[PDB]
Amino acid sequence: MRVTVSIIKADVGGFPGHAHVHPKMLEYAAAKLKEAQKRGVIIDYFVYNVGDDISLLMTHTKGEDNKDIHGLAWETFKEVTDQIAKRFKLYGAGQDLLKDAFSGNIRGMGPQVAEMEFEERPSEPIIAFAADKTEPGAFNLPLYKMFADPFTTAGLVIDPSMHEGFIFEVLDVVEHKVYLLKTPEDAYSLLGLIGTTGRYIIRKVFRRADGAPAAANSVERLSVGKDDPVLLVRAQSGLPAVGEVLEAFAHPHLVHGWMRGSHAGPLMPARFISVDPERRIAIGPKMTRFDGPPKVGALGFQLHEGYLEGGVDLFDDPAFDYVRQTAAQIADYIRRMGPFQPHRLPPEEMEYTALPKILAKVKPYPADQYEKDRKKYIEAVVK
Amino acid sequence: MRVTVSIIKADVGGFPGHAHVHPKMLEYAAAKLKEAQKRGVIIDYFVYNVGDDISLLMTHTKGEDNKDIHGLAWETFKEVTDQIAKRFKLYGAGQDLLKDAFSGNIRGMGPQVAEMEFEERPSEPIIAFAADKTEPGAFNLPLYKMFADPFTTAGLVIDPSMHEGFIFEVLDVVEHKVYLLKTPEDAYSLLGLIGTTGRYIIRKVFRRADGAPAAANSVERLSVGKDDPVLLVRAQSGLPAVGEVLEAFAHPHLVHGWMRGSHAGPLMPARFISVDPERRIAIGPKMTRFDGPPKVGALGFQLHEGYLEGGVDLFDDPAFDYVRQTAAQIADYIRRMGPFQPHRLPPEEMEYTALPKILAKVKPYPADQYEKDRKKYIEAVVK
Amino acid sequence: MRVTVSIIKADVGGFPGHAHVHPKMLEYAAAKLKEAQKRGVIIDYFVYNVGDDISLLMTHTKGEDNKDIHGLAWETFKEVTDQIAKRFKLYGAGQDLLKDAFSGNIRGMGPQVAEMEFEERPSEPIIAFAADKTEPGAFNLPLYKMFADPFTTAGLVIDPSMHEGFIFEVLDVVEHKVYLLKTPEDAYSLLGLIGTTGRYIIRKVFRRADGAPAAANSVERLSVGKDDPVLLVRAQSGLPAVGEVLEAFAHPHLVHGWMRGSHAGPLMPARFISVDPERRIAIGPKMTRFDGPPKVGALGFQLHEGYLEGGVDLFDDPAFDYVRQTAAQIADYIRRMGPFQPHRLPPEEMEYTALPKILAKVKPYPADQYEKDRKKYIEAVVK
Amino acid sequence: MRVTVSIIKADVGGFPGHAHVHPKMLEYAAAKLKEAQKRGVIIDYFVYNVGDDISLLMTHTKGEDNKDIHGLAWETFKEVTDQIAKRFKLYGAGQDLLKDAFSGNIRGMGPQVAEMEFEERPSEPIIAFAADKTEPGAFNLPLYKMFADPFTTAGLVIDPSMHEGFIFEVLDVVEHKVYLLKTPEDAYSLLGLIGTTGRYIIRKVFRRADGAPAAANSVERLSVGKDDPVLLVRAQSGLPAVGEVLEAFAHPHLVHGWMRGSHAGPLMPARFISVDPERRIAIGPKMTRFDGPPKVGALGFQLHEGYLEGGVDLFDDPAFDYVRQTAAQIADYIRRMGPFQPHRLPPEEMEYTALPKILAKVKPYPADQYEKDRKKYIEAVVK
Amino acid sequence: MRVTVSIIKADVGGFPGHAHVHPKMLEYAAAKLKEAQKRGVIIDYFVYNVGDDISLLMTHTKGEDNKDIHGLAWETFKEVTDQIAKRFKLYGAGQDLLKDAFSGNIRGMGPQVAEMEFEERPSEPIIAFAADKTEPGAFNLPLYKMFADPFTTAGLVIDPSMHEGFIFEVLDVVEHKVYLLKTPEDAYSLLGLIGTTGRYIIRKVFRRADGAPAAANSVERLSVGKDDPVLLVRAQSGLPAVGEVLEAFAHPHLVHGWMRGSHAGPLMPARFISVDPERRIAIGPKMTRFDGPPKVGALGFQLHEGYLEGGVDLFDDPAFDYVRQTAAQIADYIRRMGPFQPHRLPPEEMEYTALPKILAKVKPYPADQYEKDRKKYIEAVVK
Numbered sequence A, B, C, D, E: 001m002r003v004t005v006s007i008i009k010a011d012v013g014g015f016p017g018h019a020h021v022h023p024k025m026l027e028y029a030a031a032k033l034k035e036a037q038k039r040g041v042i043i044d045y046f047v048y049n050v051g052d053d054i055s056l057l058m059t060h061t062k063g064e065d066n067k068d069i070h071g072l073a074w075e076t077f078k079e080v081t082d083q084i085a086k087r088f089k090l091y092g093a094g095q096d097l098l099k100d101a102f103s104g105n106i107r108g109m110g111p112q113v114a115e116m117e118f119e120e121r122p123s124e125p126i127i128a129f130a131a132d133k134t135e136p137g138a139f140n141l142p143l144y145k146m147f148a149d150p151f152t153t154a155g156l157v158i159d160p161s162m163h164e165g166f167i168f169e170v171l172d173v174v175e176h177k178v179y180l181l182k183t184p185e186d187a188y189s190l191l192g193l194i195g196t197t198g199r200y201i202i203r204k205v206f207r208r209a210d211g212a213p214a215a216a217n218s219v220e221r222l223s224v225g226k227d228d229p230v231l232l233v234r235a236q237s238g239l240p241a242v243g244e245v246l247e248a249f250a251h252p253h254l255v256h257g258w259m260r261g262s263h264a265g266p267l268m269p270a271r272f273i274s275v276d277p278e279r280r281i282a283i284g285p286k287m288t289r290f291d292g293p294p295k296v297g298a299l300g301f302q303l304h305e306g307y308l309e310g311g312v313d314l315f316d317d318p319a320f321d322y323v324r325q326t327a328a329q330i331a332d333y334i335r336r337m338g339p340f341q342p343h344r345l346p347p348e349e350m351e352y353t354a355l356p357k358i359l360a361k362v363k364p365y366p367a368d369q370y371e372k373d374r375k376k377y378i379e380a381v382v383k
């Protein structure tokens, strides 16, 4: 049968500030999706957070872009906001619920969505990712690596089915344009684009042999835009092994975001604090020093008949402690830089804050004229 | 509504020696504040320790310096002392209950108090800190950093509302005098003072734009004086982000105190051993090698209608493990110094111990006369 | 009132081999001492292990060397051996129950005993230690440090009462002789002796000012002898602070024992796996690589009216993780040495194994004669 | 007397590629400035390189912007290019000699110039810096720190003369505008600007008390622009101590440039390979892995009567080996990022390379239309 | 024969600022002492620097406090100052030549002097030390360790002649008083004093068995006072082995001084840059980051008939690279503390700078009155 796997993510209230979610937020969303399950709306679900973003992972048969699945997620976010965030006066309550109405589609309303509709396989392992304190371009490098880099994904070299490579669907979020690029041949051009992570964002990957969908990352054209993305990746059987996918994250590369959406720091692959598959909830890591560093969590599932068996915390292994130690140490090195590029983002990712405003001052003197005048201009200031 | 958030801290019995508190101490204080809640005395509370100091965090509407809130905390400390510390023959039972009477105000009676009365905000995240085995000047540097250092608090550079800086209320605990200093312009003078952490202690910080209170640190003029302080900081929304506040502690600077209140060692930001928000108790870290090193704990809350939602252990993140590893290693390096300045405090912080006494011996010879006499003075000793 | 605090330790069954104890061993010993408590035999107790040695900590009023307390401990070891070790066919079941009869005193029968009888103080914090896979001389250095080294115990320099130093009771286990030495003046001679840890063993320390007992280490003259010792130390109030005592262990010095009682490795200060003060049991660390490394555990209590409030795991602090990391790394360095001095003990601690036997071969040639004969002696071997 | 100290820097030939200079380049420039000295054109000189940029440090009395000093440096660069770079077919021979004519002033012709004209002091220590493989904004942070950061320059807090702070002359290289900012009060605005290191570049610093010049960094408005800058800083006596200046560089912050002027990596403070004050030449470090990492060198002098006594390699101290080890390790971490932001510069510093060209392809599909067409667009590619 | 070994040290000109000496300074002092040798004034000499302090080590037979030896050193410092420091306009030229006249004795005129007059032994190894950027109390800990600590000097435990310990001559530089203390018995009191390194300074050590002199450290009562000390230690043969002396320095303890004589940092044991025993000169390390860290150098000699055979750089061994790496890393950790105690010295070592001056402002409000007035006092500032 054709299942649709759908992640719909939103920040609706931080506890405290931007550090974590409140757990009743999770409890209430799980309780609500359990009604929709009972009512036949969805087959299975799982509810978790990373930092302060709630992810609603849902299986169902209404396909992509569906207004009842997108509706259900909207409704269920609205209700956490009114019943809990507003109740507890949580920080940035209702943050991502930017638009107010609700046409039919949730995209470009504030929450993030990655979905894939495929025919379920004999075995169907998927990984589900969520990052906090970063932007969707943060997965551009793990995505490139796992589907295109031979040093990460051995399957590219030694598995016949992957040998032909993958199709990359790249969204230009600035000018609302899509590029289809196909590895290996187009690797250097793909990189030419996606390496500018603020603007060219891998939205979907497709297997080239049969067209099968492989991954969908959460990204929309600017206006909303995109904070803290969520990713869905399908694994094994002519698609990256689960561990080739996990390897793509073994190096905590630097991502944009961190504190005030204006700095860069290492992407730490974190453990969940607890995973309760019976109650269908997982509590992810907190964000602490400087509001991060930025973090990604990974839960793996096996789907059967649309049911979600899992999830398993896939960054839970001593091997990832080394990675975590590295990221802690880089977060520390890079922070000693204070408010300077490249620790601080370029002015354009600044432009959305309010550095510009300030510059309502100073009085700038044009250079050619100040150059024959330096001495009295300083003489002024000095007295 | 105007809430008052009030921390009132005391060491009333160590278990064993100076290492920790007994847990029934916490249990009994929580049970007691729950009566006062029921009776309408206070809106909410939370009871925790770091090392051997019990903190009673209480919300209420009686404002600062109130004799019923200060009374309640006194009463509730007295009762732990008689019912438990004295019962179990705990070490330094009733330690901080120095005075005996109880005029109206608790300050200068032994326990430490930081309170703030503000109009509650749309979202109102506060952080609550407690350090053990140090002195109130230990927060002078984290306080300076989070409100005045651009390398710590990006908000100073990129958030319009903080751009104008803060007012620092500095108490001269030695001569009972207060200095108001305002950053940025007065930074170098603020530092001139507060860098002498034994004497010029940041007691309160105020936002300069509107006068809003931002932080209150626990400090009183000498006589009592001040051990193991507690700090209250309000975050977000024109005030340091929660993570800019947590960053101010990312470097385990050296603080005075540690063993016998006479040495200096790194301030380790520690995790709580357990946080039970349902029973309103948290058990902090123990103090071990050399009676520390010194440690600070951080709990974050969101206030609604005076209710304390929390607390969240905000030093609970792999990023702070690096910091903790650093502090462990410095505690080890610096200790190899034994009883020597600067590992050992200057003589004046010694003067309150009993190095002076000793020096009831030796016989000191005046120099000018010993200089023509060295040879027979040694000839003596030798025989 | 005068309490006696009494630790009586024995290895009666390893699970598996020499790695740990079986937990019913602990359960059964706790159940048994609870009868004796009920019957008035003893005031309080606590039952724990480190590696494969069971420690019975008991409070009571029968004073030192008492035959009912020593009897109770014997009886209760015999019963674990018959009811559990023998039942489960545990390794080296009944190991330390060497003698067979039972005159009146347990010392020189196999188990280890440290006791102190003192008048209980206003506050009376004691620490209770147990090491596995080493010998009683392993505490010679922590003992020296905490009572005699100014770099460890600041109290020696800055506390008037300790300024006069301590009396060291040193047992020569080889020739059954006792030396009384008193620090500071006799430091160099104390060291001359105790630095030979296999033979001159600090058995007791006494405060010099008033004669008060301070510490008692578990040691008996050879025949039995002594494996895996237990130590009792009283803290605070003119005696080392609890943290000066814990500092004496902050450096994992090398001790004799480890694997087959014939090697040297670092003394790792370990955490307990669990501490249950309600059931009066604690499960200590396992011994793994090469049967260690060697380890010591520390539980602190506060005594009131002979009741044992505790115990607290006093090596449970991030600061001791650094120490633990160091010890892991030295255990690794030193092991690459294989069977060579000094990783391997001197021949005399070998002499109690069976290196000697072997040397029933080779044929040794006397040197003076072999020297004019080398060439044909090799010519032989070669053909 | 009023001396002018003048550094005029140029890349005129790499050996090999971009790694170093050829030593006859240095030899020939020294030989040439020795004529000009003999002829009275200049008082003293010193000739050194870092990476592949030659620095001509010259003392003289013709003041700033002088056409004979700028001429002499031009002439002497032209002659190295024709007599050596072109001779040996060195890489990028004559690179920085962009313009062809020579009006009167060297600025905006390709080479970099920092000069200061001051009255020589009783003692007059200056430091002279040169960086390779970076851009002039690389010194924005060391410059800010040494004149404005109290954590770097203790003199700001404890020296009366510096207490009043400094004037920062900031050039907007993009719109040819100058900003005068004065610390402390304007710190946050200074940072608002200079933290965008690609565009707002500290060109000069002046002491605020008397107007004295303190530092001049090498920077010109875009067209030329600016690679690998050179800095001149005066030290001591109401101006940063020599070591407060050296401290500003103790943390290898990330700078733009490195390989192909398109990446960011740590600024390594390097030693010179040799310093020959008798022949007035110093050979700086090579640039190796990935064409760096980027590096800065420091030579200190004492001026007397315009004579340059020195120079001393001021990064030659074990303390800077730690810094160097850190930078090596970051260069290694950050490089594993390949062609991705922030390791790779933002598109705008790309725009001067030729990423744009490429994008002569792919065919971009507008999003709104591709969204109802995905399936056949992939069906295409797949077949 | 009775030789006198005499070190007389002075800072007379830094190159640049405070980083090093100019080498002609050394050359000229060596040339000058070679005349005095030729003339019979002195038997042998050696001339070296550490940081910016020149040491004149001289052997001779005029005994301690001699006016011709002290004169010769004065004269020879004056001449370097006029002929070189003043010539080259070096920084702080003539710095230590504070007084102007010259009664007979050099002590309390600015330079530092350590001398010992002993009967030369069958073999007579001495070590000669010089530290820069610290104060004479910096050797208090190495001095204590090598003569009194059994963990440093094994000879105390295992060599019969040292078993009786040493006499410590302690100068109270604040009240011009001398204390004779004798180890072991007086260890704790010695420490009580010398651990306050700013005031109780070990000036001389004497062997207790025969009265022999062992060490003399450079220290005078305040007025002058004391910067950057020099130490002379005699080794072997009932006195610490050369390596027990070198061990006393194996841990880079924190010392007062560093930058602006107002901070604390690790004492790095450094190598000499070059040792030329034929020309009788050695060039020591430079001081760089933050004007240090502080450093000590060690040259060993063998005396025969007063001739100085040597010197050997005794910190030149890979084993000391570990120590040097540690010190680099601590210098880095502790510096992140900026202007705060204990990185910054206590106010009293401040009092000699000019923190006090500043505090000509702010207006301090007395506390009791400000406490009922806070709100309008902030209302003021805010408007």
Ligand SMILES: [Mg+2]
Binding pocket: A011, A014, A017, A018, A052, A091, A092, A095
């Ligand atoms: Mg948020």
Ligand SMILES: [Mg+2]
Binding pocket: A011, A051, A052, A053, A132, A133, A228
């Ligand atoms: Mg978020």
Ligand SMILES: [Mg+2]
Binding pocket: B011, B014, B017, B018, B052, B091, B092, B095
């Ligand atoms: Mg206490």
Ligand SMILES: [Mg+2]
Binding pocket: B011, B051, B052, B053, B132, B133, B228
């Ligand atoms: Mg306390």
Ligand SMILES: [Mg+2]
Binding pocket: C011, C014, C017, C018, C052, C091, C092, C095
């Ligand atoms: Mg066993």
Ligand SMILES: [Mg+2]
Binding pocket: C011, C051, C052, C053, C132, C133, C228
């Ligand atoms: Mg055992």
Ligand SMILES: [Mg+2]
Binding pocket: D011, D014, D017, D018, D052, D091, D092, D095
């Ligand atoms: Mg080039």
Ligand SMILES: [Mg+2]
Binding pocket: D011, D051, D052, D053, D132, D133, D228
């Ligand atoms: Mg270049």
Ligand SMILES: [Mg+2]
Binding pocket: E011, E014, E017, E018, E052, E091, E092, E095
């Ligand atoms: Mg100097």
Ligand SMILES: [Mg+2]
Binding pocket: E011, E051, E052, E053, E132, E133, E228
């Ligand atoms: Mg000096």
